[PDB]
């Protein structure tokens, strides 16, 4: 099966930061990339980070040196480091990976930016 | 030919020396089969070589000697996507540039040692 669960998120000041953590489970973590996904209102849901099981990080070009996304293998937890919030990224953000055949998505937490 | 998995590149053009380019390929059809995608280049009179690769659920990376650090490889595994960023272009890098999936450890060349290829980009780089 495999579960990715999301946490954190919520309201948040534009210029703020947030931190949203993924905790996985039955899947074998260390050997997987995982990825943040989003879904911004009447936009098709989008890549924003993604981390391989090497470590090499690719960003979105909208949040590059505003978000960071991290991993702790020990953990099975991966991180995204929101920083300089603004209303573009006011979205449902998903966390990521594909063990096999299937894709593997968290329940989606929200990410709600106002002034 | 055909083929279970559709691939298309597309981003290619005429740049100059320095110039940056970013490549794009839409993988179609059972993309859920992919296990691991590349790009490869077709110098002319040459033979098609490789360039980056990328494993599909790993997403780890590698460069053919030539890149020397300026090319970066990347996919999508959910918009079914595999992507080259292309810095510093010099004329040497002028080619066609094939998209592949899923290499195939029997074949007697490169071609034939990857199920499923695009119809290739050209890349023009002067000065």
């Known amino acids: 099966q495999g579960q990715l669960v999301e946490s954190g998120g919520g309201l948040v000041q534009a210029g703020g930061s947030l931190r949203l953590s993924c905790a996985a489970s039955?899947?074998?973590?260390?050997?997987?990339?995982i990825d943040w996904y989003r879904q911004a209102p009447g936009k098709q849901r989008e890549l924003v980070a993604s981390?391989?099981?090497?470590?090499?990080?690719n960003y979105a070009d909208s949040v590059k040196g505003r978000f960071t996304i991290s991993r702790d293998n020990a953990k099975n937890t991966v991180y995204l480091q929101m920083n300089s919030l603004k209303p573009e990224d006011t979205a449902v953000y998903y966390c990521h990976t594909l063990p096999r055949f299937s894709h593997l998505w968290g329940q989606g937490t929200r990410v709600t930016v106002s002034s | 030919g055909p083929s279970q998995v559709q691939l298309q590149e597309s981003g290619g053009g005429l740049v100059q020396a320095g110039d940056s380019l970013r490549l794009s390929c839409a993988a179609s059809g059972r993309t859920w089969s992919i296990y691991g995608m590349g790009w490869f280049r077709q110098a002319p009179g040459k033979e098609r070589e490789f360039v980056a690769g990328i494993t599909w659920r790993g997403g780890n990376t590698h460069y053919a000697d030539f890149v020397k650090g300026r090319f970066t490889i990347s996919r999508d595994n959910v918009k079914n996507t595999v992507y080259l960023q292309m810095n510093s272009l010099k004329p040497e890098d002028t080619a066609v540039y094939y998209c592949a999936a899923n290499p195939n450890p029997s074949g007697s060349s490169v071609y034939r040692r990857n199920d499923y290829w695009g119809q290739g980009t050209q890349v023009t780089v002067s000065s």
């Open positions: 039955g899947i074998i973590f260390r050997e997987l990339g």
């Open positions: 981390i391989a099981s090497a470590g090499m990080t």
